[PDB]
Amino acid sequence: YSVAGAPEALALRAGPPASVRAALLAARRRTLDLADDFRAALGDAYPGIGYAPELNPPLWELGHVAWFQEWWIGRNRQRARGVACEPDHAREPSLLPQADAWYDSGRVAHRTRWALPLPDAEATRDYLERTLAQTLALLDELPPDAHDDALYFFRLVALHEAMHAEAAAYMAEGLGIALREGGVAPQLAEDAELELPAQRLRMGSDAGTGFAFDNELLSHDVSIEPLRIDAQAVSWARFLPFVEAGGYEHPAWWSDAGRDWLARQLLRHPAHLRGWQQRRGGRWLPLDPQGAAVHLNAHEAEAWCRWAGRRLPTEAEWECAALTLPGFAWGRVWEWTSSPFEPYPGFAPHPYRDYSAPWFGTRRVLRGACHATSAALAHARYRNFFEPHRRDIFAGFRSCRAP
Numbered sequence: 553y554s555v556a557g558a559p560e561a562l563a564l565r566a567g568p569p570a571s572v573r574a575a576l577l578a579a580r581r582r583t584l585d586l587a588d589d590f591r592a593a594l595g596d597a598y599p600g601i602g603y604a605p606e607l608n609p610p611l612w613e614l615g616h617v618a619w620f621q622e623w624w625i626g627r628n629r630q631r632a633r634g635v636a637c638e639p640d641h642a643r644e645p646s647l648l649p650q651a652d653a654w655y656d657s658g659r660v661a662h663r664t665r666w667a668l669p670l671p672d673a674e675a676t677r678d679y680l681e682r683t684l685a686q687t688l689a690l691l692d693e694l695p696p697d698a699h700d701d702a703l704y705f706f707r708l709v710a711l712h713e714a715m716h717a718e719a720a721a722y723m724a725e726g727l728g729i730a731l732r733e734g735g736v737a738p739q740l741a742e743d744a745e746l747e748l749p750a751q752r753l754r755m756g757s758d759a760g761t762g763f764a765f766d767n768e769l770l771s772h773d774v775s776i777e778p779l780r781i782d783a784q785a786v787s788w789a790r791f792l793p794f795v796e797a798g799g800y801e802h803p804a805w806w807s808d809a810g811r812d813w814l815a816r817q818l819l820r821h822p823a824h825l826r827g828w829q830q831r832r833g834g835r836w837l838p839l840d841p842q843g844a845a846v847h848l849n850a851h852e853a854e855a856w857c858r859w860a861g862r863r864l865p866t867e868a869e870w871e872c873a874a875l876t877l878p879g880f881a882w883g884r885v886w887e888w889t890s891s892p893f894e895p896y897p898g899f900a901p902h903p904y905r906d907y908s909a910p911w912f913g914t915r916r917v918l919r920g921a922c923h924a925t926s927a928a929l930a931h932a933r934y935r936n937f938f939e940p941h942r943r944d945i946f947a948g949f950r951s952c953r954a955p
């Protein structure tokens with residue numbers, strides 16, 4: 553197998569304290585850069601945005617990132633235990649007396665987040681700074697040969713912050729907020745197909761390759777059947793002939809859930825489009841056909857596939873291809889699979905017990921990464937998981953077929 557991600561992703565998961573230190577600093581620089589993009593648009597108004605289930609107020613997100621880091625690092629009396637940490641052991645206070653009522657995503661009700669007496673933006677950024685200084689002081693006590701258990705929570709909180717930075721980016725796109733950061737379409741999209749031979753895949757994350765998310769365990773052998781798979785995610789050039797052929801008016805290409813979704817849509821075409829313009833950073837721009845198709849849900853991906861005589865890969869097929877085919881290029885958009893988000897054999901929840909387990913059975917797996925995913929997070933073993941209707945996320949897909 554090839555490496556699963558860029559050097560930063562391997563270093564965060566397996567590297568020494570100095571690697572995780574650099575990752576925490578890089579994560580915070582990205583968080584604050586995105587916070588400054590939201591500040592330019594919203595002027596530090598709280599809540600600053602209207603209510604929707606797919607949003608959180610930007611200043612709430614910032615406080616949550618700080619709270620999570622402080623909960624699992626400075627206040628955690630069992631850091632050295634790693635995955636054996638008792639999640640509900642007695643903690644000493646937060647810097648903020650109300651932080652546990654305001655920022656714990658498992659405690660604070662969703663709509664409530666718009667109506668809390670939160671600190672102002674400057675005081676929120678001070679909370680971030682003070683908790684990061686605490687975190688880094690504790691990290692600097694660890695020796696170069698620190699065990700995985702010793703580094704576990706430092707790695708976890710770096711990755712958590714990376715996930716919320718990507719959420720800031722897809723929320724921004726929904727809210728028409730322009731960011732300084734952004735991905736670049738290729739001059740020419742690749743349409744090629746690759747052969748994936750029959751093979752055994754050792755799926756998931758092995759005991760000692762460093763940090764694993766709980767949903768990557770246990771590692772387990774699976775059989776891969778021969779297939780031909782797209783070398784890259786489906787481009788808008790490849791997607792749009794489905795729309796031109798009437799695919800959003802032909803219920804027969806759609807599943808039952810896809811038909812129920814399709815019947816409740818005001819606009820019979822992809823999200824964010826009105827050839828076509830695309831709304832990006834609150835500006836209507838001409839659509840680039842070479843870009844990866846994006847903001848498509850699983851129902852839209854599946855219908856395209858039926859129209860094309862192709863299918864989605866399973867997450868195992870995707871992982872196998874990513875690790876074994878040098879021509880398999882990913883990382884532009886998250887890619888819907890056909891696989892429901894379900895535990896691997898031998899799954900056990902890790903100390904952040906609510907990360908995976910509540911979401912089994914209602915989410916679909918996406919693989920890969922998008923342009924707004926941290927280089928430290930993007931990884932071929934990583935399982936993303938969203939409800940199959942979601943279009944706000946930077947999701948697209950690739951297709952495959954029999955040999």
Ligand SMILES: C[N+](C)(C)[C@@H](Cc1cnc[nH]1)C(=O)O
Pocket residue numbers: 712715716907936937938
């Ligand atoms: C793994 N995803 C991206 C589906 C998670 C990430 C997450 C952040 N804080 C807890 N979990 C999500 O959006 O809830």
Ligand SMILES: [Fe+3]
Pocket residue numbers: 616620657712716
């Ligand atoms: Fe979170």
